[PDB]
Amino acid sequence: MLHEIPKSEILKELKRIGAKRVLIQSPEGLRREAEELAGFLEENNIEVFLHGEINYGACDPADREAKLVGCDALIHLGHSYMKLPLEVPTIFVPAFARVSVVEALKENIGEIKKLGRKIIVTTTAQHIHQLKEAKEFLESEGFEVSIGRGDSRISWPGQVLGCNYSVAKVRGEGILFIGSGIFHPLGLAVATRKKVLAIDPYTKAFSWIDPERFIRKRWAQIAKAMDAKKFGVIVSIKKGQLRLAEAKRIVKLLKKHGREARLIVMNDVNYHKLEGFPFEAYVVVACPRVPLDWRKPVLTPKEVEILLGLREEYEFDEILGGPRESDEPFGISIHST
Amino acid sequence: LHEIPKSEILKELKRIGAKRVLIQSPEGLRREAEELAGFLEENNIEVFLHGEINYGACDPADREAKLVGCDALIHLGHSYMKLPLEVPTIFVPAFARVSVVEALKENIGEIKKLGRKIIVTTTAQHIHQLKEAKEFLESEGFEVSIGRGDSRISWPGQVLGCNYSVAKVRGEGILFIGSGIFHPLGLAVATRKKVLAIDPYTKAFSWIDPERFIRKRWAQIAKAMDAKKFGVIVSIKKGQLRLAEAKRIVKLLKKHGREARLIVMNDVNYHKLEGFPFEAYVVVACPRVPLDDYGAWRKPVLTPKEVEILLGLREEYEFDEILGGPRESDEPFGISIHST
Ligand code: SF4
Numbered sequence A: 001m002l003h004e005i006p007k008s009e010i011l012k013e014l015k016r017i018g019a020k021r022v023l024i025q026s027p028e029g030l031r032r033e034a035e036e037l038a039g040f041l042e043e044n045n046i047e048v049f050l051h052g053e054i055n056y057g058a059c060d061p062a063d064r065e066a067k068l069v070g071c072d073a074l075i076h077l078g079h080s081y082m083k084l085p086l087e088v089p090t091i092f093v094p095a096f097a098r099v100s101v102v103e104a105l106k107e108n109i110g111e112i113k114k115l116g117r118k119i120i121v122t123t124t125a126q127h128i129h130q131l132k133e134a135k136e137f138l139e140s141e142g143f144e145v146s147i148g149r150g151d152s153r154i155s156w157p158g159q160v161l162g163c164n165y166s167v168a169k170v171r172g173e174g175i176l177f178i179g180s181g182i183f184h185p186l187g188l189a190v191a192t193r194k195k196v197l198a199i200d201p202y203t204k205a206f207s208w209i210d211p212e213r214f215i216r217k218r219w220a221q222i223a224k225a226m227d228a229k230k231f232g233v234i235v236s237i238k239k240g241q242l243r244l245a246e247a248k249r250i251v252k253l254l255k256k257h258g259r260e261a262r263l264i265v266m267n268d269v270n271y272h273k274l275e276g277f278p279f280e281a282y283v284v285v286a287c288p289r290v291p292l293d294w295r296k297p298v299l300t301p302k303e304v305e306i307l308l309g310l311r312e313e314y315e316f317d318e319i320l321g322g323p324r325e326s327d328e329p330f331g332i333s334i335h336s337t
Numbered sequence B: 001l002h003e004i005p006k007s008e009i010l011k012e013l014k015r016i017g018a019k020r021v022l023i024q025s026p027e028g029l030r031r032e033a034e035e036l037a038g039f040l041e042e043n044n045i046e047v048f049l050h051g052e053i054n055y056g057a058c059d060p061a062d063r064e065a066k067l068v069g070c071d072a073l074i075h076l077g078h079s080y081m082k083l084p085l086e087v088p089t090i091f092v093p094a095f096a097r098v099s100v101v102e103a104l105k106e107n108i109g110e111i112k113k114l115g116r117k118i119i120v121t122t123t124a125q126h127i128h129q130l131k132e133a134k135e136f137l138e139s140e141g142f143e144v145s146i147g148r149g150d151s152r153i154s155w156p157g158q159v160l161g162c163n164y165s166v167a168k169v170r171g172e173g174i175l176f177i178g179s180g181i182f183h184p185l186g187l188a189v190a191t192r193k194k195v196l197a198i199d200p201y202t203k204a205f206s207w208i209d210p211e212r213f214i215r216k217r218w219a220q221i222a223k224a225m226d227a228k229k230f231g232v233i234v235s236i237k238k239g240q241l242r243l244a245e246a247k248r249i250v251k252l253l254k255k256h257g258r259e260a261r262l263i264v265m266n267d268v269n270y271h272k273l274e275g276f277p278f279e280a281y282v283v284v285a286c287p288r289v290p291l292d293d294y295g296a297w298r299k300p301v302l303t304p305k306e307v308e309i310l311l312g313l314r315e316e317y318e319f320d321e322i323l324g325g326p327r328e329s330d331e332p333f334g335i336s337i338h339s340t
């Protein structure tokens, strides 16, 4: 259960810029809400088209598609803005979970103390609105809380993305991750080399991350690719995912070391679409969730470096941004150009 | 003609000074795409392969090519259909080698039942064989009629799953040369004429009966009768975007008591839509999607024409075709290069 979408504030914003037709994109868990919002803005004299693709991040705005079908603006549900040039005015509408993080923290104080006195705290967008309460609670328990601002791919200090842990690159004896799943906590452990404790707000369960098994299974994938002679280097056209210079460099690099290499252009990166190609191994240079989370070895740019022996220590693939001036609001936002 | 003219392609590329090209390919030519790329790269042209699986010239990857800085696009497996293109595009049609005459001779007794004046049609892969099929049928006493088709078609006599314009000519019965049932079925429902399909490989013939198919559609329409919320889908694929027609359908459903929302997609498939509240869908893009579903759609999915029947505006069934305008010329039987 999440907090309700700010229909009124949204409508007001569209009217402010004067918008007659808008495209609404939404993530898996907000399909029913996207239609409610559409039926609402329509009764208010605004033509609405729903984006039928399932959105997975602000790194993939449907501004191009909006343009193509004549929409004045774009409404992006469920995610906050990340620095990207946009072709049509876009209103981001973050989703905030109501579950209490503090309750999950109080249940696990003992485990958190094992982390250290000065600790780095991180969380995902859905709990970012409760980060301040979590910080004050931890401080009242004797911790010094270090929260990093992060870079331009990030919306709020302390927020991590599966492909970006810049807010965690600060000083601390250990890292506390507030949220569910193991992908974020795992990336944090690999990216920072510090001990990580993950606490799931819903179940209140805790997990001490051990990257070992993960790194092992990845090396096994690297080993298999060591025998390959033919590689496919994949990029995605999604605005916040396109890493062409980096892909072109991996191609040049595989060739230098006696491998055949081909740059492959896609939108959604699905191994399923590549089964008929002759490549023996693949390198995905886009969202790292793809290779890190395939009948043939699929790797990240970092792993291909390791495979070619040009890198020794295992590293998590990240999409970094440059410095960020301000922070996004804890509510909707409008962005243009 | 039955091979990728690597050298003819390099020539046309060197001629326009292309340095970086994107190559798209259908499922059956994935390995050919990479061999062509290897060949072009040995000749000073950077090559990128489009990773998506292509299903027709109705889905050119010129925009994507533009997005990654390619100065040209190579479209393998299909011939050109009229559409604006953002970069010079070379179309490399696939031509099957099989000679079709033997299979016609074998079934000459069945072809006779179509009548004296017959309409002859085939798909892209056997198009170069139409001249021979014509000479044979004429040498057997038939009067062969071959329609030019519209701008969505590349050569006279060619049908597409969504376009049977070449068959809208004077003629008693229709002969279809090819394998598979989708095309012959589309012909029968689109022209409401008698269709005889002959497979050039097996020499097997088939008199087409749309009855089964039509009943199945009525059924589907029935299942949507008690639906109130409708999703009306369009695809942003260049040769498939039918925005005006989709909007019209949204307006029509609303005027008739139903709720309807226009949905924009690229690849149209049910899974992406499962989370939406809509009870029924209307696909206003490629007709093969709703008319040839193997079972991926868990909710009733219809074509624009079927909606009109459901709403009670149309009485007889009609095939959802994507029509083009007059075509001034015909594409070559080999590669072609276009730039709009
Ligand atoms: S690149 Fe991948 S991890 Fe990063 S925001 Fe997009 S979908 Fe999420």
Ligand code: SF4
Pocket: B055, B056, B057, B058, B059, B160, B161, B162, B163, B239, B240, B285, B286, B287, B288, B322
């Ligand atoms: S039948 Fe569908 S995929 Fe084939 S050419 Fe027509 S629109 Fe394109």
